[PDB]
Amino acid sequence: ANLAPLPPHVPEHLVFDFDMYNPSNLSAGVQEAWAVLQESNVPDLVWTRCNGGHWIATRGQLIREAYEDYRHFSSECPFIPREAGEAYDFIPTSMDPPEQRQFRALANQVVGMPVVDKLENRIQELACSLIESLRPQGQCNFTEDYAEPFPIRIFMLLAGLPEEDIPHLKYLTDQMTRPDGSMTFAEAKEALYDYLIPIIEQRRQKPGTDAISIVANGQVNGRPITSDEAKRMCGLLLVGGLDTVVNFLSFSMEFLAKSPEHRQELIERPERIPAACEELLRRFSLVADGRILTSDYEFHGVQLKKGDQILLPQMLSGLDERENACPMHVDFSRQKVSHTTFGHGSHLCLGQHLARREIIVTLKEWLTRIPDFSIAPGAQIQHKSGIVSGVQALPLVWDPATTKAV
Numbered sequence: 493a494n495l496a497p498l499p500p501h502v503p504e505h506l507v508f509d510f511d512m513y514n515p516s517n518l519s520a521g522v523q524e525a526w527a528v529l530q531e532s533n534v535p536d537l538v539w540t541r542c543n544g545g546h547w548i549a550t551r552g553q554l555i556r557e558a559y560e561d562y563r564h565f566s567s568e569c570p571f572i573p574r575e576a577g578e579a580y581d582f583i584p585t586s587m588d589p590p591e592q593r594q595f596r597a598l599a600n601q602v603v604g605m606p607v608v609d610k611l612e613n614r615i616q617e618l619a620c621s622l623i624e625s626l627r628p629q630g631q632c633n634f635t636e637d638y639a640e641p642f643p644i645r646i647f648m649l650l651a652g653l654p655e656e657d658i659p660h661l662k663y664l665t666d667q668m669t670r671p672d673g674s675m676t677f678a679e680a681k682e683a684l685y686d687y688l689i690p691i692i693e694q695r696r697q698k699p700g701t702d703a704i705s706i707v708a709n710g711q712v713n714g715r716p717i718t719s720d721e722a723k724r725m726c727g728l729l730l731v732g733g734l735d736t737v738v739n740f741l742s743f744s745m746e747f748l749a750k751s752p753e754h755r756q757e758l759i760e761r762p763e764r765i766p767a768a769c770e771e772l773l774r775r776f777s778l779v780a781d782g783r784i785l786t787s788d789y790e791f792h793g794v795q796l797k798k799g800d801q802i803l804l805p806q807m808l809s810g811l812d813e814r815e816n817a818c819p820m821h822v823d824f825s826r827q828k829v830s831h832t833t834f835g836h837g838s839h840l841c842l843g844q845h846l847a848r849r850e851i852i853v854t855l856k857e858w859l860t861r862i863p864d865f866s867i868a869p870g871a872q873i874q875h876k877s878g879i880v881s882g883v884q885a886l887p888l889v890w891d892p893a894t895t896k897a898v
């Protein structure tokens with residue numbers, strides 16, 4: 493690990509060199525690896541010298557606070573490392589209130605609740621189709637066989653982009669959240685923009701009903717959105733569509749593959765599925781971005797300097813034992829599932845309704861046709877960490893004789 497020189501204003505007792513891109517205890521699971529930050533030996537707000545050096549709030553209370561106080565904690569540079577957060581210019585995520593407001597409203601028009609209600613039939617259709625297709629095989633590589641195609645095809649459908657462009661696009665979005673060293677954030681971002689530019693141009697000329705057309709021809713601040721602003725909002729839609737639900741689905745199915753009574757519980761009481769979805773969202777939270785200090789500020793006894801970056805792991809809030817008792821235990825009956833999995837503050841996830849729909853549909857439709865399954869014998873499941881964490885591969889196996897078509 494390459495630790496950056498401790499800045500003079502950071503007390504040595506607050507140092508804890510956690511690498512968000514390669515946590516030390518990753519072998520135990522990614523959420524577990526991040527949960528080490530919540531052990532008794534770690535202060536509530538620490539400084540890691542990894543990835544250029546930055547703060548990390550480890551408690552739900554501080555994460556919520558920082559997310560609410562955009563005045564001190566700006567989204568202008570929300571990604572670690574520094575180079576990534578600076579090149580990051582997505583709309584509305586790189587803006588603080590009140591600017592983000594008009595732009596957030598437009599994005600909502602395209603991925604909001606009404607749109608989800610409108611596409612529910614296609615969502616239901618694809619889920620059933622993909623699963624019925626896998627059902628008689630008795631095995632599947634969940635990440636590539638379902639986790640990826642289900643949410644991504646729905647997104648490409650919503651955006652009016654050919655499914656043929658998925659491989660190319662997914663490689664680029666993944667470079668921004670889980671860098672493999674092949675390219676800088678800026679380069680992955682530019683390439684993604686190169687893809688969108690002609691499409692936006694074209695859809696501004698001849699408007700459609702797809703998400704890209706709606707955004708490109710939308711109104712913000714009483715005037716027409718610019719091509720640049722359109723490109724920046726669409727870049728974000730792509731990332732959210734291709735690299736969020738995709739990863740989350742695999743953590744959930746990995747858990748279900750190892751939990752027969754949890755499976756059977758949803759099978760008998762499908763009305764519990766929405767709660768189970770919420771609990772899985774808490775237990776398998778997977779996003780971690782942050783903010784930048786707009787000025788010198790003392791936060792909970794810690795002196796933060798202007799320009800200091802602070803990671804505010806959305807993932808940690810619900811795993812915080814102060815927020816949920818026995819945080820690592822999955823309990824579908826939890827009277828209160830506290831979490832910030834979809835974020836907190838003015839930038840609360842707009843695609844959260846689409847995400848829950850996809851999750852709930854997956855849970856019901858999978859358990860219906862394939863009620864009994866397990867991880868392939870031998871298989872060693874590996875997780876990966878970054879702005880969005882995921883599962884490398886998820887080999888599942890089952891006896892076709894136990895499955896049932898609908």
Ligand code: HEM
Nearest residue numbers: 584585596729732733736737740834835839841842843847
């Ligand atoms: C399990 C799935 C998902 C998770 C965990 C997730 C998480 C998040 C988080 C934590 C934020 C706030 C980031 C910040 O405050 O800087 C966010 C923002 C947002 N999400 Fe999601 N998201 C998910 C799926 C989606 C989907 C399906 C889309 C749709 C393409 C998407 C689009 C958005 C948008 C537009 C914003 C920005 C809102 C704003 O800046 O005002 N997300 N998401």
Ligand SMILES: CC1(C)[C@@H]2CC[C@@]1(C)C(=O)C2
Nearest residue numbers: 585731732736779781879
């Ligand atoms: C942090 C996010 C999950 C949120 C939607 C996709 C993502 C990586 C962003 O850039 C904003």
Ligand SMILES: [K+]
Nearest residue numbers: 568577578580
């Ligand atoms: K920036």
